[PDB]
Each structure stands twice: as structure tokens, then as C-alpha cells.
Amino acid sequence: SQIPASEQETLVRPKPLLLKLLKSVGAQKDTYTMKEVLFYLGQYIMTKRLYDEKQQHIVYCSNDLLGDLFGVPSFSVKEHRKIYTMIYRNLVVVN
Ligand SMILES: CCOc1cccc(CN2[C@@H](C)[C@@H](N)[C@H](c3cccc(Cl)c3F)[C@]23C(=O)Nc2cc(Cl)ccc23)c1
């Protein structure tokens, strides 16, 4: 476990661009837990096929909404701390 369970439950308000990404996969509301935000971003990556099927551990997000939010062309899905950092820049923490 890389991310503490307490941190996973953190209530957050996504900024407009991340909120557009979430709404595109049916996420209706304005506040979530990070766990829920991570779930929906998971659905987004799977729905848009943002990976090589032979090498599924790397997400490629260049020229996509996700890369505009994250500020990277790609990233490893193993590095959870860096993924949390990139998500934190696109939201306001509530609690
Ligand atoms: C058939 C294709 O399958 C996939 C291909 C690539 C990615 C995924 C979705 N992944 C899985 C690999 C989870 N282990 C990974 C994950 C889960 C919890 C926390 C973090 Cl920090 C985390 F990274 C997660 C997820 O569930 N949400 C999410 C959001 C982002 Cl932005 C990046 C990665 C992920 C599925």
C-alpha cells in the first residue's frame, strides 16, 4: 500500500477541466473522495484505450484531456504517489 487509506477517503472538489473529464464518463456531482476520482479516471483510461494492450502498465495521455490536466505525455500506473500529486493540482481539498 503506497497511499494511506485515510488519504484515499479525502473529500475533494475537482477544478473545471478535471470536472469535465469526470462528467464525460458519467460522474454527475461536484465533490468526491479521491478513491472515487481514481475509479472514474480508471474508467476514462479503459474507455479511451490510453495504453498499449501488450504493455498495460503505461498510460499515454499526450494530446488528450488527461495529459492537459497531468502535464505529462505518459506515466507508469505503478507510481501511485505521483498520480495522487498530479490529481491534487486539479482540485481543492475539502477536509
Ligand atoms: C484493461 C486496461 O486496464 C487499465 C489500464 C490502465 C489503467 C487502469 C486503471 N488503473 C489500474 C491499473 C489501477 N491499479 C490504478 C490505480 C488504482 C488506485 C490508485 C491508483 Cl494511484 C491507481 F493508479 C488505475 C485505476 O484504477 N485508476 C487509475 C487512475 C489513473 Cl490516473 C491511473 C491509473 C489508475 C486500467
Swiss-Prot record:
Induction profile? By DNA damage.
* Assembly with partners or alone: Interacts with p53/TP53, TP73/p73, RBL5 and RP11. Binds specifically to RNA. Can interact with RB1, E1A-associated protein EP300 and the E2F1 transcription factor. Forms a ternary complex with p53/TP53 and WWOX. Interacts with CDKN2AIP, RFWD3, USP7, PYHIN1, and RBBP6. Interacts with ARRB1 and ARRB2. Interacts with PSMA3. Found in a trimeric complex with MDM2, MDM4 and USP2. Interacts with USP2 (via N-terminus and C-terminus). Interacts with MDM4. Part of a complex with MDM2, DAXX, RASSF1 and USP7. Part of a complex with DAXX, MDM2 and USP7. Interacts directly with DAXX and USP7.
Protein's UniProt name: E3 ubiquitin-protein ligase Mdm2
Give the record's family classification.
Belongs to the MDM2/MDM4 family.
* Disease implication from the record: Seems to be amplified in certain tumors (including soft tissue sarcomas, osteosarcomas and gliomas). A higher frequency of splice variants lacking p53 binding domain sequences was found in late-stage and high-grade ovarian and bladder carcinomas. Four of the splice variants show loss of p53 binding.
Q: What is known of its domains?
A: Region I is sufficient for binding p53 and inhibiting its G1 arrest and apoptosis functions. It also binds p73 and E2F1. Region II contains most of a central acidic region required for interaction with ribosomal protein L5 and a putative C4-type zinc finger. The RING finger domain which coordinates two molecules of zinc interacts specifically with RNA whether or not zinc is present and mediates the heterooligomerization with MDM4. It is also essential for its ubiquitin ligase E3 activity toward p53 and itself.
Q: Where is this region: Necessary for interaction with USP2?
A: 1-94
Annotated stretches, region: Sufficient to promote the mitochondrial pathway of apoptosis: 1-85
Modification(s) after translation: Phosphorylated at multiple sites near the RING domain by ATM upon DNA damage; this promotes its ubiquitination and degradation, preventing p53/TP53 degradation. Autoubiquitination leads to proteasomal degradation; resulting in p53/TP53 activation it may be regulated by SFN. Also ubiquitinated by TRIM13. ATM-phosphorylated MDM2 is ubiquitinated by the SCF(FBXO31) complex in response to genotoxic stress, promoting its degradation and p53/TP53-mediated DNA damage response. Deubiquitinated by USP2 leads to its accumulation and increases deubiquitination and degradation of p53/TP53. Deubiquitinated by USP7 leading to its stabilization.
Domain SWIB/MDM2 residue range list: 10-93
Q: Where does it live in the cell? A: Nucleus, Nucleoplasm; Cytoplasm; Nucleus, Nucleolus; Nucleus
Span of the entire protein shown here:
17 to 111 of 491
Cite any additional comment in the entry: MDM2 RING finger mutations that failed to ubiquitinate p53 in vitro did not target p53 for degradation when expressed in cells.
What this chain does, per the entry, is described as:
E3 ubiquitin-protein ligase that mediates ubiquitination of p53/TP53, leading to its degradation by the proteasome. Inhibits p53/TP53- and p73/TP73-mediated cell cycle arrest and apoptosis by binding its transcriptional activation domain. Also acts as a ubiquitin ligase E3 toward itself and ARRB1. Permits the nuclear export of p53/TP53. Promotes proteasome-dependent ubiquitin-independent degradation of retinoblastoma RB1 protein. Inhibits DAXX-mediated apoptosis by inducing its ubiquitination and degradation. Component of the TRIM28/KAP1-MDM2-p53/TP53 complex involved in stabilizing p53/TP53.
* Tissue/organ expression: Ubiquitous. Isoform Mdm2-A, isoform Mdm2-B, isoform Mdm2-C, isoform Mdm2-D, isoform Mdm2-E, isoform Mdm2-F and isoform Mdm2-G are observed in a range of cancers but absent in normal tissues.
